Design a protein around this ligand. Structure first.
Ligand SMILES: CSC[C@H]1O[C@@H](n2cnc3c(N)ncnc32)[C@H](O)[C@@H]1O
Ligand SMILES: O=S([O-])[O-]
Ligand SMILES: O=S([O-])[O-]
Ligand SMILES: [Zn+2]
Ligand SMILES: [Zn+2]
Ligand SMILES: [Zn+2]
Ligand SMILES: [Zn+2]
Ligand SMILES: [Zn+2]
Ligand SMILES: [Zn+2]
Length: 268
């Protein structure tokens, strides 16, 4: 399967990456394991991103009703059309972060690592049942980080606010060409049944400097928006969870800051 990649790459005379965050999955058992973890059946409509040379895509097309696969490289698409004969796959040309997504109930995909963050935020705001995606292990660990831990960040918060996230297994670096410098991780995401929907400008504001207390953080980001300090100082000194640093906040605690600011005219 590494061999099949080498033969496809030479056949079309193409180099195995345009960019730095890109690694082809080349173990059949990790593919079949992503698919079994996702429970892909003949009724499911799947989104995939960065199909590469169609290894995962081919397996998804045997099992699902319909697959949409988003690919940025027009040269890769010409190869997927020549190399495969799928009735039920729709290749979409574009940056997966920018293009409109189709309706899908599931995602099964090895994410190019350069887009791990924007893809994840975009997905969490989507109506899906289940997603099984490959990331770097550090990024996956960031996604399951708990409030108050050192790697807890905007990503962690939103993942916990909107999803249930488990790392299914470590994936060895041996399993990609070219070999990454670190291991990847098979990650399951389901939407929370009881989502905590937070204002994105607020969260962005707060975690611009997640090391600050929540009063410092709110005062700085709202001054930056053009508002007098004196106009803001009182309202923000009565903000809930003021004894916390931003990186210690549960989604539930952000929600109360939001409703407090909403009530006091700041966010609208
Ligand atoms: C899965 S890692 C490599 C594959 O992802 C594709 N790819 C890389 N970046 C993006 C992107 N932003 N949107 C969609 N496909 C991408 C590349 O063209 C390659 O086929
Ligand atoms: O299993 S990882 O350490 O190669
Ligand atoms: O190049 S990979 O290690 O992100
Ligand atoms: Zn096939
Ligand atoms: Zn790091
Ligand atoms: Zn599980
Ligand atoms: Zn100033
Ligand atoms: Zn609190
Ligand atoms: Zn509360």
């Amino acid at each position: 399967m590494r061999d099949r990649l080498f033969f496809l790459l030479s056949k079309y005379g193409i180099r195995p990456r345009d960019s730095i965050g890109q690694h082809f999955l080349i173990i059949e058992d990790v593919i079949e394991k992503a698919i079994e973890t996702a429970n892909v059946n003949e009724n499911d409509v799947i989104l995939e991103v960065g199909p590469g040379l169609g290894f995962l895509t081919d397996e998804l097309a045997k099992r699902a009703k319909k697959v949409y696969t988003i690919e940025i490289d027009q040269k890769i698409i010409e190869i997927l059309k020549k190399e495969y004969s799928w009735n039920n796959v729709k290749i979409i040309q574009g940056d997966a972060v920018r293009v409109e997504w189709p309706k899908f109930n599931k995602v099964v995909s090895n994410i190019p690592y350069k887009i791990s963050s924007p893809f994840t935020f975009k997905l969490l705001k989507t109506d899906f049942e289940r997603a099984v995606v490959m990331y770097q292990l550090e990024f996956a660990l960031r996604m399951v980080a708990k409030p108050g831990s050192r790697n807890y960040s905007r990503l962690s918060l939103m993942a916990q606010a909107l999803g249930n996230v488990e790392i299914v297994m470590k994936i060895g670096k041996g399993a990609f060409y070219p070999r990454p410098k670190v291991d990847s991780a098979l990650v399951l995401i389901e939407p929370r049944k009881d989502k905590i929907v937070l204002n994105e400008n607020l969260v962005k504001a707060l975690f611009q400097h997640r090391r600050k207390t929540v009063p410092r953080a709110l005062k700085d980001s709202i001054h930056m928006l053009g508002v007098s300090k004196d106009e803001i100082r009182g309202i923000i000194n009565n903000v809930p969870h003021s004894n916390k640093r931003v990186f210690q906040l549960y989604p539930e605690e952000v929600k109360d800051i939001e409703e407090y600011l909403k009530k006091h005219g700041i966010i609208s």
